[PDB]
């Protein structure tokens, strides 16, 4: 039987990978980091409260100008916020109200969203007509589209619930690159700062590092015990952190190809919806199901602070590109800005 | 106050956007959200044409009441990752064929379509997001089941069934077996209706169940529930 021989070879390869990971690990991040000063207590106050959504807010994204926001809720409305003045720049009515992701273009020209309609809809913000119209609708996913991220005005990577990540060409609307290999539904997505690689967290308790220009998985990261719902690169692009339903955040390194540190507490038992990093990467912000965001010392696994003030589950997180503020969205139809 | 002309005009635009958002929310608050569920293509389509590829939107108005019925068919993924989106629906319309008690699902060996429907109903009814959400259970294809129960007994489906091979007793037994999967009888209600291929009164049953749910929500708002 060739199938049993190939299963034995796959088991041998997995054991070789595990042995190479074990032999390459000598001193953990705790053992080197325990000799530096902690960050103390990180206290943040709600500076703005963005009201106007009427259903559970499922996603958000910050602008690269660190002032403009976009948020998605089950109202069927994509509201673009001026976070400095608490002003609604745009309100985009959606064809499908079951939106679970939204992205904002780095140029600021476009907004994507997607959800249970299996379609990433690109919206042209800066039109000659003065309204926000659909640029195009990207179809081809057979499952719910769980995350989308703009590379530029013409390239976008969309995570989806068909156990498949996909890279699209917005000029043609065609499936440029298909990323396959995940067993469970892919729930999160995060682009590298140079947009050369990206990581995806799925429901197979695994994270995979893909290359955009070759379209095939480089490394696979395991260690979680439940469905990964959040993922985010470290700011230099050489590491990333995940968040799953087992109330643990794990930090993984691309070069070491290992898990470095678990950010978990005994008093936290609920799942993690959103994971975001600060500008320096020293603080890891994670949104949980117990209605608040916990700031973690990303180098020391210490609870640096708690961002409490949401009446329902914190579903989405976002730190501005200048690191000035963190914005938490939640199922109680509110967005809050913190400093 | 300490605002420019463009700042004041942007604030005015934001207030207009807030006004349109409030009107849209008030329009959507009077609509009835229904989640349509069932094990495969069993009776969803006949029910849909009786009132009227990702999620399917079905819009119909009955007695000056607008209904939003969502079909999550062909969403072949983990249900728990998107079933919390329908936490605030008015009721769940669960469609079950009565004639597939002896048919096989053909996806798994020795798998019954009826038992797959029981397992899906057990997962949906006792879900954490549907603790207080009522279920309008529809038992599809009663005439086909009535004419085929003479040829094939129900004991091949339920080994512990010892009643007569009649339509009424076995149909009541199937309804009781589906209602026994509700472990939250003190906080939710299951409405069961038997529907034929061409049955006119299906909408009225949905309207009555939705009206009971709306009465319960109204008493919840006034503190009587």
């Amino acid at each position: 039987s060739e199938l049993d021989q190939l299963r034995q070879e796959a088991e041998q390869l997995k054991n070789q990978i595990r042995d190479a990971r074990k032999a390459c690990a000598d001193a953990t991040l705790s053992q080197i980091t325990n000799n530096i000063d902690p960050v103390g207590r990180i206290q943040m106050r709600t500076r703005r409260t963005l009201r106007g959504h009427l259903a559970k807010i499922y996603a958000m994204h910050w602008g690269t100008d660190s002032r403009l926001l976009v948020s998605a809720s089950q109202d069927g409305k994509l509201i673009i916020w001026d976070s400095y003045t608490t002003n609604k720049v745009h309100a985009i009515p959606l064809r499908s109200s079951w939106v679970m992701t939204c992205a904002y273009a780095p140029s600021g020209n476009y907004v994507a969203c997607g959800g249970l309609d299996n379609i990433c809809s690109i919206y042209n913000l800066k039109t000659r007509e003065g309204n926000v119209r659909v640029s195009r609708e990207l179809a081809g996913h057979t499952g719910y589209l769980s995350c989308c991220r703009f590379l530029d005005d013409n390239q976008i990577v969309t995570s989806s619930g068909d156990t498949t990540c996909a890279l699209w060409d917005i000029e043609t609307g065609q499936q440029t690159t298909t990323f396959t290999g995940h067993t469970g539904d892919v729930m999160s997505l995060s682009l590298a700062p140079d947009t050369r690689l990206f990581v995806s967290g799925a429901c197979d308790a695994s994270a995979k590092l893909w290359d955009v220009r070759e379209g095939m998985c480089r490394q696979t990261f395991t260690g979680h015990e439940s469905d990964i719902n959040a993922i985010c690169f470290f700011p230099n692009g050489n590491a990333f952190a995940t968040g799953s339903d087992d109330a643990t955040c794990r930090l993984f390194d691309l070069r070491a190809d290992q898990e470095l540190m678990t950010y978990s507490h005994d008093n936290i038992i609920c799942g993690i919806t959103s994971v975001s990093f600060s500008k320096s990467g020293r603080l890891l912000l994670a949104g949980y199901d117990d209605f608040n965001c916990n700031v973690w010392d990303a180098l020391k696994a210490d609870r640096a602070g708690v961002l409490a003030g949401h009446d329902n589950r914190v579903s989405c997180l976002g730190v501005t590109d200048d690191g000035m503020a963190v914005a938490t969205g939640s199922w109680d139809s509110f967005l809050k800005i913190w400093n | 106050c300490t605002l420019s002309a463009e700042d004041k005009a942007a604030v005015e635009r934001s207030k207009m956007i807030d006004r349109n958002l409030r009107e849209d929310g008030e329009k959507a608050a009077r609509e009835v959200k229904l989640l349509l569920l069932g094990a495969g293509e069993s009776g969803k389509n006949t029910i849909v044409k009786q009132m009227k590829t990702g999620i399917v939107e079905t819009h119909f108005t009955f007695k000056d009441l607008h209904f939003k019925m969502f079909d999550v068919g062909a969403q072949r993924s983990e249900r728990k990752k998107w079933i919390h989106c329908f936490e605030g629906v008015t009721a769940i319309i669960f469609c079950v064929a009565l004639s597939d008690y002896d048919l096989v699902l053909a996806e798994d060996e020795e798998m019954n379509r009826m038992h797959a429907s029981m397992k899906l109903f057990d997962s949906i009814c006792n879900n954490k997001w549907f603790t207080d959400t009522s279920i309008i259970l529809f038992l599809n294809k009663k005439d086909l089941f009535e004419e085929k129960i003479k040829k094939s007994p129900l004991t091949i489906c339920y080994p512990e069934y010892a009643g007569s091979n009649t339509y009424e007793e076995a149909a009541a037994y199937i309804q009781c077996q589906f209602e026994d999967l509700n472990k939250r009888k003190d906080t939710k209600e299951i409405y069961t209706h038997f529907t034929c291929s061409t049955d006119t009164k299906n909408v009225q049953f949905v309207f009555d169940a939705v009206t009971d749910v709306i009465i319960k929500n109204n008493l919840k708002d006034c503190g009587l529930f």
Partner: single-chain antibody, 234 residues
């Protein structure tokens, strides 16, 4: 495409009443604030009236306040200017101006073609342009300077200076909308700068397409005041 067409102009006796209509096509008329800007035969742009989106905020120039009436009807995409008691100084070519206001928006971007109307026989931010007519050789850089009595830099960091180019026999178009922000459809050789009350507009590698009259306008506080107008010849 976006178009604003004016109608209703003509020869009217002094003291009469005429109504100007502005039919809008190619854009969402309801979401745009709308302005009336007139140009007298002495070649000077003057703001007249402004109506916001939804008609919630209405402003008038101090010379036409209580004498003119601006209105819009968003179902038929028409902007109106009901004018009563017309005087001899109301003889001007009225332009219907399109403007939207959000963060990063570009108001005054599109202007209508303009209708010609003929009448027979203190606290405003005064803006002055030192050069009214200078010759320029094509292919060489030129700078147009503008000054304001009040500082146009607001506390939010925006300097509300607007640069307009009006070619001969053509409607004005927007080049710079907040003191540096290059507009859409205008080439990259137009660049604006300045700070406070001193301003300049640099046109490197000038061509015959850039020949016209340049106006600087503030949008800090109503009424909106235009510059005298700098014409580039040769």
């Amino acid at each position: 495409d976006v178009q604003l067409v004016e109608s209703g102009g003509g020869l009217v006796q002094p003291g009469g009443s005429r109504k100007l209509s502005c039919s809008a096509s190619g854009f969402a008329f309801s979401s745009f604030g709308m302005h009336w800007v007139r140009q007298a035969p002495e070649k000077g742009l003057e703001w007249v009236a402004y109506i916001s989106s939804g008609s919630g905020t209405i402003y008038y120039a101090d010379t036409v306040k209580g004498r003119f009436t601006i209105s819009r009807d968003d179902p038929k995409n028409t902007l109106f200017l009901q004018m009563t008691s017309l005087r001899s100084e109301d003889t001007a070519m009225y332009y219907c101006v399109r403007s939207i206001y959000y963060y990063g928006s570009s108001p005054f971007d599109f202007w209508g073609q303009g209708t010609t109307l003929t009448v027979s026989s203190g606290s405003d931010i005064v803006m002055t342009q030192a050069t009214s007519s200078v010759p320029v050789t094509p292919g060489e850089s030129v700078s147009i300077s503008c000054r304001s009595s009040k500082s146009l830099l607001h506390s939010n960091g925006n300097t509300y200076l607007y640069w307009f180019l009006q070619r001969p026999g053509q409607s004005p178009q927007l080049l710079i909308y907040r003191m540096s922000n290059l507009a859409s459809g205008v080439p990259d050789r137009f660049s604006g700068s300045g700070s406070g009350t001193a301003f300049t507009l640099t046109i490197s590698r000038l061509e015959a397409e850039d020949v016209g009259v340049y106006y600087c306008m503030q949008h800090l506080e109503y009424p909106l005041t235009f510059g005298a107008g700098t014409k580039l010849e040769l």
